[PDB]
Amino acid sequence: PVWKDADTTLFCASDAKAYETEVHNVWATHACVPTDPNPQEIHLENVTENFNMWKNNMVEQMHEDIISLWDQSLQPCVKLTGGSVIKQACPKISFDPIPIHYCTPAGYVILKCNDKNFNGTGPCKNVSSVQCTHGIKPVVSTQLLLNGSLAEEEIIIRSENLTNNAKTIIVHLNKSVEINCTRPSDIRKAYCEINGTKWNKVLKQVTEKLKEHFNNKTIIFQPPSGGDLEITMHTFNCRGEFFYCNTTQLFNNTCIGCNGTITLPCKIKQIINMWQGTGQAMYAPPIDGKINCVSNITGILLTRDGGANNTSNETFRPGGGDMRDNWRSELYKYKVVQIE
Numbered sequence: 001p002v003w004k005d006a007d008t009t010l011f012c013a014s015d016a017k018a019y020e021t022e023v024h025n026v027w028a029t030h031a032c033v034p035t036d037p038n039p040q041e042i043h044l045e046n047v048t049e050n051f052n053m054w055k056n057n058m059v060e061q062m063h064e065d066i067i068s069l070w071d072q073s074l075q076p077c078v079k080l081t082g083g084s085v086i087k088q089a090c091p092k093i094s095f096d097p098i099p100i101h102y103c104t105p106a107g108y109v110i111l112k113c114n115d116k117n118f119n120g121t122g123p124c125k126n127v128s129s130v131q132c133t134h135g136i137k138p139v140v141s142t143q144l145l146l147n148g149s150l151a152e153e154e155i156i157i158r159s160e161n162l163t164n165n166a167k168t169i170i171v172h173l174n175k176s177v178e179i180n181c182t183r184p185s186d187i188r189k190a191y192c193e194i195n196g197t198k199w200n201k202v203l204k205q206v207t208e209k210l211k212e213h214f215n216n217k218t219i220i221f222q223p224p225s226g227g228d229l230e231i232t233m234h235t236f237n238c239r240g241e242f243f244y245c246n247t248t249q250l251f252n253n254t255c256i257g258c259n260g261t262i263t264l265p266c267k268i269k270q271i272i273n274m275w276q277g278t279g280q281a282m283y284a285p286p287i288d289g290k291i292n293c294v295s296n297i298t299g300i301l302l303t304r305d306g307g308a309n310n311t312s313n314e315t316f317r318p319g320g321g322d323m324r325d326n327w328r329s330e331l332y333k334y335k336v337v338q339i340e
């Protein structure tokens with residue numbers, strides 16, 4: 001084969017069930033085709049191919065899809081956008097993300113980087129071709145990347161430019177850490193439980209990896225410094241409910257009698273600032289009974305403080321808010337090429 005770099009409109013594929021009322025299933029039933037029943041991955045002999053996860057139009061395309069999914073599926077009692085108000089009915093929905101495959105039309109193919117320690121930019125030596133990506137769950141969150149894929153070998157630091165502190169850092173974990181979030185049967189009070197032993201061990205490895213990238217400086221974690229609640233809290237959607245969880249206990253440099261269960265305090269919020277950047281939305285109060293989601297932490301979103309150039313330290317704070325980084329954390333090993 002012979003190819004050239006190119007962008008083109010993708011289509012999606014999924015295992016969505018036509019009988020489900022769950023909203024990702026409904027969306028994917030009418031906006032995606034069924035998954036490839038016979039996927040074939042073709043290794044490319046003696047092929048080195050350069051990738052750049054930070055300039056990858058697949059990310060913008062998935063982002064457009066997820067905006068469309070949420071716009072079609074979430075039913076606010078009151079939308080507030082641009083100096084407008086839209087009232088409507090806001091019934092409780094069934095919400096649980098399903099994997100979505102992204103696929104090339106005729107004349108194009110997806111190249112896949114299989115170097116286990118590939119950081120997202122530069123040459124890839126073990127390159128395969130695929131017709132569709134693997135199935136990516138479109139999980140919206142801040143601070144912690146949830147229910148994703150794990151790095152196969154070492155923890156990976158991904159950034160467009162580590163030297164530029166305005167550029168988000170994506171940490172790719174090699175070992176998931178469960179986060180178990182419950183609103184038990186104050187109806188908005190909730191909590192998340194994490195195994196502190198595993199978390200602290202993983203976070204210690206993360207600090208050592210950051211030390212490799214920052215000329216051995218001391219790595220310090222601190223809580224976010226201002227912003228909207230969606231960014232200063234780990235925010236995510238559990239069964240249709242918007243959870244906001246305080247992570248100060250996770251970014252604790254002293255534990256880097258503290259090896260039991262970490263319990264993060266959370267609140268379910270009805271009024272949110274939408275990640276589509278469109279303004280505020282109000283939803284109904286939470287459903288009755290026990291509301292529970294067990295998720296895998298598979299990545300971390302970090303921002304490094306500026307102004308530490310002449311100091312002995314680098315300090316990192318949980319970040320997020322641009323969901324493109326969530327999609328990028330999974331699309332990093334893929335790029336579209338035009339077959340020539």
Ligand SMILES: CCOC(=O)N1CCC[C@H](C(=O)Nc2ccc(Cl)c(F)c2)C1
Pocket residue numbers: 140141142228230231235236237242272273274275276277320321322
């Ligand atoms: C570029 C930095 O971010 C922003 O400027 N934003 C504006 C205000 C907060 C927005 C947000 O993140 N909303 C959100 C909503 C629901 C869930 Cl479940 C969630 F995880 C995140 C993003």
Ligand SMILES: *[C@@H]1O[C@H](CO)[C@@H](O)[C@H](O)[C@H]1NC(C)=O
Pocket residue numbers: 114115126128
């Ligand atoms: C290339 O990646 C494949 C995964 O597709 C894996 O078996 C191995 O790491 C590599 N194999 C070869 C022959 O390079």
Ligand SMILES: *[C@@H]1O[C@H](CO)[C@@H](O)[C@H](O)[C@H]1NC(C)=O
Pocket residue numbers: 119120121122123157158159162
């Ligand atoms: C990623 O790898 C390339 C070498 O291909 C290097 O130039 C770049 O600094 C690396 N970035 C990170 C964040 O490790």
Ligand SMILES: *[C@@H]1O[C@H](CO)[C@@H](O)[C@H](O)[C@H]1NC(C)=O
Pocket residue numbers: 147148175176295296
């Ligand atoms: C959580 O991680 C394990 C591997 O660490 C994986 O087998 C399991 O399927 C993951 N769960 C989810 C919901 O992704």
Ligand SMILES: *[C@@H]1O[C@H](CO)[C@@H](O)[C@H](O)[C@H]1NC(C)=O
Pocket residue numbers: 152153154155156174175205209
């Ligand atoms: C995870 O990566 C670190 C290096 O960043 C390594 O020390 C550790 O052995 C890895 N763990 C697993 C389970 O691969």
Ligand SMILES: *[C@@H]1O[C@H](CO)[C@@H](O)[C@H](O)[C@H]1NC(C)=O
Pocket residue numbers: 161162163164165
């Ligand atoms: C990375 O960021 C630093 C500081 O913002 C800047 O001086 C440098 O030119 C950037 N490097 C690249 C390759 O963009």
Ligand SMILES: *[C@@H]1O[C@H](CO)[C@@H](O)[C@H](O)[C@H]1NC(C)=O
Pocket residue numbers: 180181182193294
């Ligand atoms: C999650 O936590 C709840 C209550 O904290 C508990 O009942 C449940 O067994 C936990 N599930 C897992 C998988 O740890």
Ligand SMILES: *[C@@H]1O[C@H](CO)[C@@H](O)[C@H](O)[C@H]1NC(C)=O
Pocket residue numbers: 195196197198
């Ligand atoms: C907490 O993590 C430790 C260390 O990895 C592990 O032995 C144990 O399975 C976890 N705790 C429980 C109650 O499973």
Ligand SMILES: *[C@@H]1O[C@H](CO)[C@@H](O)[C@H](O)[C@H]1NC(C)=O
Pocket residue numbers: 215216
């Ligand atoms: C960083 O510290 C490590 C500690 O193992 C050492 O091996 C290495 O020489 C140091 N590198 C720099 C650039 O300071």
Ligand SMILES: *[C@@H]1O[C@H](CO)[C@@H](O)[C@H](O)[C@H]1NC(C)=O
Pocket residue numbers: 232233246247248
């Ligand atoms: C998180 O909890 C700490 C105390 O545990 C508190 O000082 C901090 O203000 C909380 N974060 C936010 C965003 O309220």
Ligand SMILES: *[C@@H]1O[C@H](CO)[C@@H](O)[C@H](O)[C@H]1NC(C)=O
Pocket residue numbers: 096097139146147236237238239292293294295296
């Ligand atoms: C992660 O996956 C599990 C298993 O499908 C699910 O129960 C959980 O709610 C998911 N978490 C989020 C935040 O979607």
